[PDB]
Amino acid sequence: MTEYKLVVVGAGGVGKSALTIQLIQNHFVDEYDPTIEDSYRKQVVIDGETCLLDILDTAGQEEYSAMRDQYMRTGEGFLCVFAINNTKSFEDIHQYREQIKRVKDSDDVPMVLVGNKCDLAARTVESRQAQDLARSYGIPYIETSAKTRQGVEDAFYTLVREIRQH
Amino acid sequence: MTEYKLVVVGAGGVGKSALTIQLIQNHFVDEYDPTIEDSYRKQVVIDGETCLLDILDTAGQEEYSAMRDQYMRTGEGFLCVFAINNTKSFEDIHQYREQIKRVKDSDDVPMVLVGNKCDLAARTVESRQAQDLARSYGIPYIETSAKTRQGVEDAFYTLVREIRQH
Ligand SMILES: Nc1nc2c(ncn2[C@@H]2O[C@H](COP(=O)(O)OP(=O)(O)O)[C@@H](O)[C@H]2O)c(=O)[nH]1
Ligand SMILES: Nc1nc2c(ncn2[C@@H]2O[C@H](COP(=O)(O)OP(=O)(O)O)[C@@H](O)[C@H]2O)c(=O)[nH]1
Ligand code: BEF
Ligand code: BEF
Ligand SMILES: [Mg+2]
Ligand SMILES: [Mg+2]
């Protein structure tokens, strides 16, 4: 059992908790209950390795956020989530990544860019724009839907692979 | 705002996680995935006081028993859960109480005894038996169903009152 410390970050309402709860429960939360901080420990097998995923589900609402540097220091990899119908949330990614790099003293931090709510027909962030940003960072981009479950295991398992391969 | 460190304990499969998830997320989970350790932070008003509930959902599977001393040290109140269709879980919850007292070095630790799965017809632990045990401890007894949501808020809120009145 190999422990991986995953942290899920991004603006309020983008789907951090919904993605995480899908991974853990195979349930879609329809309600938006702004997170303070929840943590999970989930055993999974990824490429034949028994993994203990320590997942921190963080506050994206500024009103509820505290002490981001602390959880950035301890995290091994970061799921950086935006919503494809929220341009501001995409712009906020860049700031999350900058802060993570600063806290880690490194531009090579395990990270996956997640464009969530890909079940929504009306999007404002085109896939290619996000693919381009991820390419600039040298990290994977995965499109997800917590509603349909598209990409949920892919996003988390890819992040594990990025940590393993670090 | 007052923080309350609640810890949900008891044998594997009695419904600790299902209760916690009902309280927070207002849905019932049918699949059983044994907990390692999960934590939730949730703000609520109880008896005219704004409270931050820090809820630790613990492992009942004995393979994770090494983690107990730590969470028993830090926890302020314990939701002691058994299932009304599982007599072994009732016997076990007595040992949980004894262990908590030992770790705290105190006979008066805030606790609530919870008889879960009270939606099931095939009861093997009579309410009177659990009432007798709770009376011996000097603590409340509440019957719950994570499936129907019966008693769920009552259980957690009663535990907060037990801490406040300690
Ligand atoms: N249509 C759609 N709604 C989503 C999706 N992910 C989350 N939501 C909804 O978006 C809201 C906020 O999700 P939540 O995970 O609580 O946000 P966060 O934890 O603050 O990032 C809730 O109402 C969810 O039901 C998604 O992939 N598709
Ligand atoms: N009928 C019924 N099943 C329940 C109830 N609470 C939990 N369960 C089921 O019992 C199993 C174990 O629940 P879980 O919360 O994971 O147990 P834990 O190991 O104590 O956390 C799951 O299949 C749940 O769906 C309840 O109140 N009624
Ligand atoms: F949990 Be979300 F960031 F409000
Ligand atoms: F989460 Be249970 F105790 F397996
Ligand atoms: Mg959230
Ligand atoms: Mg559990």
Ligand 2 center–CA B152 separation, angstroms: 13
| CATH class of the region A1-166 | alpha beta
- ∠ CA A16-A20-A22, rounded to 5°: 120
> Which DSSP letter does residue B157 get?
H
Domain boundaries of chain B, sorted by first residue: 1-166
In this structure, the residue with its CA closest to atom 26 of ligand 1 is: A117
The reply to whether B24 touches chain A by the CB within 8 Å rule is yes
Residue ranges of alpha helices (H) inside B75-151 are 87-104, 127-137
Nearest to A152 by CA among A4, A2, A17, A1: A17
Q: Are B118 and B143 in contact (CB under 8 A)?
A: yes
Q: How far apart are CA B94 and CA B78, in angstroms?
A: 13
Q: Kindly state whether B52 is in contact with chain A, defined as any CB-CB distance less than 8 angstroms.
A: yes
CA angle A20, A144, A53 (to 5 degrees): 30
Which of chain B's residues have a Cβ under 8 Å away from the Cβ of A31? 25-26
CB contact, 8 Å: A37 with chain B? yes
Determination technique for this entry: X-ray
- Under an 8 A CB cutoff, do B41 and A36 touch? yes
Resolution in A: 1.4
Question: Phi and psi dihedrals of A150, rounded to 5?
Answer: -50, 125
> How many angstroms separate the CA atoms of B158 and B152, rounded?
10
CA distances to A3, A47, A158 from A138, rounded to whole Å, are 24, 22, 14
User: How far are the Cα atoms of A12, A87, A125 from residue A129, in angstroms, in the given order?
Assistant: 21, 11, 7
